[PDB]
Design a protein around this ligand. Structure first.
Ligand SMILES: [Mg+2]
Ligand SMILES: [Mg+2]
Ligand SMILES: [Mg+2]
Ligand SMILES: [Mg+2]
Ligand SMILES: [Mg+2]
Ligand SMILES: [Mg+2]
Ligand SMILES: [Mg+2]
Ligand SMILES: [Mg+2]
Ligand SMILES: [Mg+2]
Ligand SMILES: [Mg+2]
Ligand SMILES: [Mg+2]
Ligand SMILES: [Mg+2]
Ligand SMILES: [Mg+2]
Ligand SMILES: [Mg+2]
Ligand SMILES: [Mg+2]
Ligand SMILES: [Mg+2]
Ligand SMILES: [Mg+2]
Ligand SMILES: [Mg+2]
Ligand SMILES: [Mg+2]
Ligand SMILES: [Mg+2]
Ligand SMILES: [Mg+2]
Ligand SMILES: [Mg+2]
Ligand SMILES: [Mg+2]
Ligand SMILES: [Mg+2]
Ligand SMILES: [Mg+2]
Ligand SMILES: [Mg+2]
Ligand SMILES: [Mg+2]
Ligand SMILES: [Mg+2]
Ligand SMILES: [Mg+2]
Ligand SMILES: [Mg+2]
Ligand SMILES: [Mg+2]
Ligand SMILES: [Mg+2]
Ligand SMILES: [Mg+2]
Ligand SMILES: [Mg+2]
Ligand SMILES: [Mg+2]
Ligand SMILES: [Mg+2]
Ligand SMILES: [Mg+2]
Ligand SMILES: [Mg+2]
Ligand SMILES: [Mg+2]
Ligand SMILES: [Mg+2]
Ligand SMILES: [Mg+2]
Ligand SMILES: [Mg+2]
Ligand SMILES: [Mg+2]
Ligand SMILES: [Mg+2]
Ligand SMILES: [Mg+2]
Ligand SMILES: [Mg+2]
Ligand SMILES: [Mg+2]
Ligand SMILES: [Mg+2]
Ligand SMILES: [Mg+2]
Ligand SMILES: [Mg+2]
Ligand SMILES: [Mg+2]
Ligand SMILES: [Mg+2]
Ligand SMILES: [Mg+2]
Ligand SMILES: [Mg+2]
Ligand SMILES: [Mg+2]
Ligand SMILES: [Mg+2]
Ligand SMILES: [Mg+2]
Ligand SMILES: [Mg+2]
Ligand SMILES: [Mg+2]
Ligand SMILES: [Mg+2]
Ligand SMILES: [Mg+2]
Ligand SMILES: [Mg+2]
Ligand SMILES: [Mg+2]
Ligand SMILES: [Mg+2]
Ligand SMILES: [Mg+2]
Ligand SMILES: [Mg+2]
Ligand SMILES: [Mg+2]
Ligand SMILES: [Mg+2]
Ligand SMILES: [Mg+2]
Ligand SMILES: [Mg+2]
Ligand SMILES: [Mg+2]
Ligand SMILES: [Mg+2]
Ligand SMILES: [Mg+2]
Ligand SMILES: [Mg+2]
Ligand SMILES: [Mg+2]
Ligand SMILES: [Mg+2]
Ligand SMILES: [Mg+2]
Ligand SMILES: [Mg+2]
Ligand SMILES: [Mg+2]
Ligand SMILES: [Mg+2]
Ligand SMILES: [Mg+2]
Ligand SMILES: [Mg+2]
Ligand SMILES: [Mg+2]
Ligand SMILES: [Mg+2]
Ligand SMILES: [Mg+2]
Ligand SMILES: [Mg+2]
Lengths: 111, 175, 141, 59, 45, 76
RNA sequence: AAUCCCCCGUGCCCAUAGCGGCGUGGAACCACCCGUUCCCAUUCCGAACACGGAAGUGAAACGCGCCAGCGCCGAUGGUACUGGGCGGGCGACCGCCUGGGAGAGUAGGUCGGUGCGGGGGA
RNA sequence: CACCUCGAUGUCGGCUCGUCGCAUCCUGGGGCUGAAGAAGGUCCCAAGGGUUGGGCUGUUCGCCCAUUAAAGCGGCACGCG
RNA sequence: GCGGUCGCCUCCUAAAAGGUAACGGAGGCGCCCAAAGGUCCCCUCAGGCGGGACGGAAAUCCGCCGGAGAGCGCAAGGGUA
RNA sequence: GCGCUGACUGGGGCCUGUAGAGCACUGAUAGGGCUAGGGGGCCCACCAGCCUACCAAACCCUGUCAAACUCCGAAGGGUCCCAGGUGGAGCCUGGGAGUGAGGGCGCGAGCGAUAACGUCCGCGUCCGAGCGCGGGAACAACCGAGACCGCCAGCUAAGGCC
């Protein structure tokens, strides 16, 4: 069994994003935590990091997400970065993935 | 069982020329070294007829040395089916891979007078120690039976080492 | 005589014969063989006449091999006609044979016998030939 | 290390791009010698007509 | 079936093409006029 | 004879090679399938036709498993 | 921050990183897991997707190692072919010079390498 | 095939007159024979000469009658208006 | 002349850019689809083995194996999970 | 009119799928092996059923073939850049044309019969228009060689030197 709905859906949505040219607001979410990474392709380089497992916070992971959401803005917007795309990878734009995006407010956005 | 050759060294000189001068181009190689040489065609032929990638050639060669080499490929030009380049493989202390003749021994093998000898492979690929090198291999069983088959693990297999893949293959049958 | 059943395309160009025997080429089934010295198209009806000549001079045992096969469609107009309007028409099949190739090749017979058969068999061919035995060199595999 | 090229065999019946080289050099007549700068480009044409020219090395 | 569908005033006639006997209804769909902008557009003649 | 037909040669292929200077618009490759894929600053039309999106120069990229790519690296 | 080890992200190279066998890892990460109230769900199924949780397990997955049976990569010689230049044969075709030079096969090689960013260590 | 000839190279057969080739029909000379003899078969040498008259059909060709040492095959713009 | 052909697409011929002829080798078009169109979200085939009432080579189902040999309205090619 | 951009050549990048080879796909294909089912030959006619001296799928070896097959793949060719290259070179605008019946040869193919002084394309060349000169006995195109004029001077090319 080569490649999986996971790996597939992952490329599918992520490949489209990488065409538009913008900086990528990649979102990896785990069972316990949710992390966020602003990457620049063609330079193969990350610019602004913002995890929850790095901000040692907890209590309802939909609300944690938004926090690490707003956390990403602050750190980033202070580096000039304003406009970006927003990955979303394998995750449907919903719950804590949608939450973090809604948190990414106070920083460029359009999402 | 022991065959002497001779040899020389190559660097320049077009193989075309050597060829013209009765000499037969060729390379000498193994895990450690690789160098181009040339034998004498008239000489080499005499040896290889009997040698034949089955037995070991010692290869004299200035340098006074005497190198344990099997012949692992003979390129002969199709137009005259004569050889045009030999490449000699030199042995060291590490199990090699080779072809060993198959002394079809026994008899008409069961149901005698008669049956079918069914000759498949006058050789066989074996991973063996460069030290002990079987001159051939006894292939008897008894024999034998009618419509049977000596696979491969049924064969003698002297204290060389073992087979070379192909656990199950013809080698014997009567029909 | 001897044609290849089911063909993707009937009627094929003709190409040249500058080759030198793709291979081949080194005997691989019998004790003796007939090798092609010249390039030619060998006709199924030429092969069948070479085969028979041997099985015949072998009492009936015997053990040919042939090794060449007529897969090339040979065409030819209906004569008494002029160029243009379709192509040949197919009147048989040939095997392409450049020098080096081993045709036929026999086994399970004496030498003064196999060699006499191969000679006969050779007279049925439009090219010059050569009889071989098979030594180490042949064991090219 | 200037080169001395000299037309010795007629190009009547040779490809047109070869008559072009004999031109790129400046050779117009048989037996004509011409001494040119020995460079890669200038050698290209000299070896292209290598069968019609005779080359010597000069001061 | 060559088709020429129009708007709903001053005509218009921005022609398209419905091939068969189904769609066989009024064969209408929302389109845009050269005049104002985006209106119903129905099928006729 | 039942044969005799054929169609007009479609003059397909690459139109700009690597290290050629192009301009926004210049079509860079005419092809049937996606023999080449649109890279950086390279669009591709409904007939799979690749063209410069901006001015600049032409460079090719063989991403092995990922196929071959035509990029228009700017300079504008 | 330096160097380094492990882990999670994300790239790049695009099989020497792959298949398969064996062995390992749960403190931390990750997964599975525990539930289906709530957002949201499955043309049926909380399998998936999704949320809220965390007792348990590294069985599955994944990560890391080892093994060359397969897969993959693969010279060096030597040929085939051939720019250009010359010969030869009734031909079908063949040979020489000078430059370029495979394919198969042989010796071998390989069960990864590395960029940026995190978390944890020394 | 379409190369000279369409500001013309008259086309079958017969007649006439030939001439040449030999892959020889007869005659001369041979070898082999499954050649007793006589008579044949088959192949070799040999082109000097010879190689009939009729019926039928425009015919060439062929069938046929009567013979013969034999009733030769071809080329010469299917020789020759 | 008779026959066949006459425009368009695909493949080869075509000599590794493009182009390239013949009464050269073989096929196809003169439509079609209001969804077979746009976008967003999900999903991944064909086969092979084993398993399972009526189920048979093949209807639907479960298991493992399966990088594309399936599919993409119709020819061929290129393309594509 | 512009004027170093030209053919050709050196270096560099990119494009290609032929020659050759290969058999991984599409097909073709020799022998052997092992086995779907049938030819069968038959036991039954309830399971069945044994054997393969004809097949023959796949599968495995050993062997091969292909314009419309390619896991491979040269040499070459195309194009751009930077250089050399001053040439009856190049480019731009315009006046005048003629040609739109080609032919031989070499090489690469198709057609044909691996026939034609055949035919149809491709790349080259000459004749065409060099039926001017030398060689090839004589001979448009094979070899040599591009004839401005004169010389009772010299060196050579092919080819030759009884
Ligand atoms: Mg071979
Ligand atoms: Mg000449
Ligand atoms: Mg309109
Ligand atoms: Mg045509
Ligand atoms: Mg075409
Ligand atoms: Mg490439
Ligand atoms: Mg990772
Ligand atoms: Mg690969
Ligand atoms: Mg593994
Ligand atoms: Mg364990
Ligand atoms: Mg594991
Ligand atoms: Mg624990
Ligand atoms: Mg714990
Ligand atoms: Mg585990
Ligand atoms: Mg893990
Ligand atoms: Mg290799
Ligand atoms: Mg080499
Ligand atoms: Mg190689
Ligand atoms: Mg290792
Ligand atoms: Mg760190
Ligand atoms: Mg004429
Ligand atoms: Mg003509
Ligand atoms: Mg006149
Ligand atoms: Mg007159
Ligand atoms: Mg006679
Ligand atoms: Mg007589
Ligand atoms: Mg007598
Ligand atoms: Mg007599
Ligand atoms: Mg005589
Ligand atoms: Mg009359
Ligand atoms: Mg008569
Ligand atoms: Mg008559
Ligand atoms: Mg008479
Ligand atoms: Mg006469
Ligand atoms: Mg006549
Ligand atoms: Mg006459
Ligand atoms: Mg008259
Ligand atoms: Mg008359
Ligand atoms: Mg008509
Ligand atoms: Mg082309
Ligand atoms: Mg299935
Ligand atoms: Mg089943
Ligand atoms: Mg079943
Ligand atoms: Mg497909
Ligand atoms: Mg299709
Ligand atoms: Mg296709
Ligand atoms: Mg396809
Ligand atoms: Mg200049
Ligand atoms: Mg140019
Ligand atoms: Mg250049
Ligand atoms: Mg390729
Ligand atoms: Mg070929
Ligand atoms: Mg194959
Ligand atoms: Mg097949
Ligand atoms: Mg077989
Ligand atoms: Mg081919
Ligand atoms: Mg093709
Ligand atoms: Mg390769
Ligand atoms: Mg070039
Ligand atoms: Mg170049
Ligand atoms: Mg310049
Ligand atoms: Mg001019
Ligand atoms: Mg002008
Ligand atoms: Mg004008
Ligand atoms: Mg005209
Ligand atoms: Mg014309
Ligand atoms: Mg022409
Ligand atoms: Mg011309
Ligand atoms: Mg010409
Ligand atoms: Mg002539
Ligand atoms: Mg030649
Ligand atoms: Mg000819
Ligand atoms: Mg002609
Ligand atoms: Mg020429
Ligand atoms: Mg004229
Ligand atoms: Mg002349
Ligand atoms: Mg001229
Ligand atoms: Mg004259
Ligand atoms: Mg003359
Ligand atoms: Mg003369
Ligand atoms: Mg002359
Ligand atoms: Mg002059
Ligand atoms: Mg002069
Ligand atoms: Mg003199
Ligand atoms: Mg001389
Ligand atoms: Mg003379």
């Amino acid at each position: 069994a080569r490649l999986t709905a996971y790996e597939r859906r992952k490329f599918r949505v992520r490949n489209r994003i990488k065409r538009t040219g913008r900086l990528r607001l990649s979102v990896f979410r785990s069972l316990k935590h949710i992390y966020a990474q602003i990457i620049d392709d063609e330079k193969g380089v990350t610019l602004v990091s913002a995890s929850s497992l790095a901000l040692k916070l907890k209590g309802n992971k939909t609300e944690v997400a938004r926090q690490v959401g707003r956390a990403l803005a602050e750190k980033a917007l202070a580096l000039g970065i304003k406009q970006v795309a927003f990955d979303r990878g394998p995750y449907k734009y919903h719950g804590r993935v949608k939450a973090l995006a809604e948190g990414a407010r106070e920083g460029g956005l359009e999402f | 069982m022991e065959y002497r050759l001779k040899a020389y060294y190559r660097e320049g000189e077009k193989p075309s020329a050597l060829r013209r001068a009765g000499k037969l181009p060729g390379v000498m190689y193994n895990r450690h070294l690789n160098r181009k040489v040339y034998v004498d065609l008239v000489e080499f032929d005499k040896v290889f007829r009997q040698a034949s990638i089955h037995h070991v050639i010692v290869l004299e060669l200035p340098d006074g040395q005497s190198l344990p080499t099997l012949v692992r490929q003979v390129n002969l030009d199709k137009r005259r089916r004569r050889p045009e380049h030999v490449d000699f493989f030199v042995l060291s202390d590490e199990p090699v891979e080779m072809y060993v003749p198959l002394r079809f021994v026994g008899t008409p093998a069961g149901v005698r007078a008669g049956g079918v000898l069914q000759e498949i492979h006058r050789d066989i690929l074996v991973k063996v120690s460069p030290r002990n090198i079987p001159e051939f291999i006894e292939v008897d069983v008894s024999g034998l039976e009618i419509g049977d088959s000596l696979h491969a693990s049924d064969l003698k297999l002297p204290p060389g080492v073992e087979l070379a893949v192909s656990p199950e293959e013809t080698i014997a049958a009567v029909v | 005589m001897l044609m290849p059943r089911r063909m993707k395309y009937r009627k094929q160009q003709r190409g040249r014969l500058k080759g030198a025997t793709k291979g081949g080429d080194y005997v691989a089934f019998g004790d003796y063989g007939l090798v092609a010295l010249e390039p030619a198209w060998i006709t199924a009806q030429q092969i069948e006449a070479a085969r028979v000549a041997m099985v015949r001079h072998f009492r009936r045992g015997g053990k040919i091999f042939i090794r060449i096969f007529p897969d090339k469609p040979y065409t030819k107009k209906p004569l008494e006609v002029r160029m243009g309007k379709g192509k040949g028409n197919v009147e048989g099949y040939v095997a392409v044979v450049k020098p080096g190739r081993v045709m036929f090749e026999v086994a399970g017979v004496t030498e003064e016998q196999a060699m006499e058969a191969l000679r006969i068999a050779g007279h049925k061919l439009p090219i010059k030939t050569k009889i071989v035995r098979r030594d180490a060199y042949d064991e090219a595999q | 290390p200037r080169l001395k090229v000299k037309l010795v065999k007629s190009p009547i019946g040779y490809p047109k791009d070869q008559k072009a080289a004999l031109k790129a050099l400046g050779l117009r007549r048989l037996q004509q010698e011409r001494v040119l700068e020995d460079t890669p480009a200038i050698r290209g044409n000299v070896e292209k007509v290598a069968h019609l020219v005779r080359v010597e090395v000069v001061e | 079936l060559l088709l020429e569908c129009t708007e709903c005033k001053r005509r218009n006639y921005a022609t398209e093409k419905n091939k068969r006997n189904t769609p066989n209804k009024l064969e209408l769909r929302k389109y845009c006029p050269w005049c104002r902008k985006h209106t119903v557009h129905r099928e006729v003649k | 004879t039942r044969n005799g037909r054929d169609s007009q040669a479609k003059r397909l292929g690459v139109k700009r090679y690597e290290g050629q200077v192009v301009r926004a618009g210049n079509i860079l490759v005419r092809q049937r399938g996606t023999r080449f894929k649109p890279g950086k600053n390279v669009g591709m039309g409904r007939d799979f036709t690749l063209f410069a999106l901006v001015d600049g120069v032409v460079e090719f990229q063989d991403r092995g498993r990922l196929g071959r790519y035509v990029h228009v690296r700017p300079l504008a």
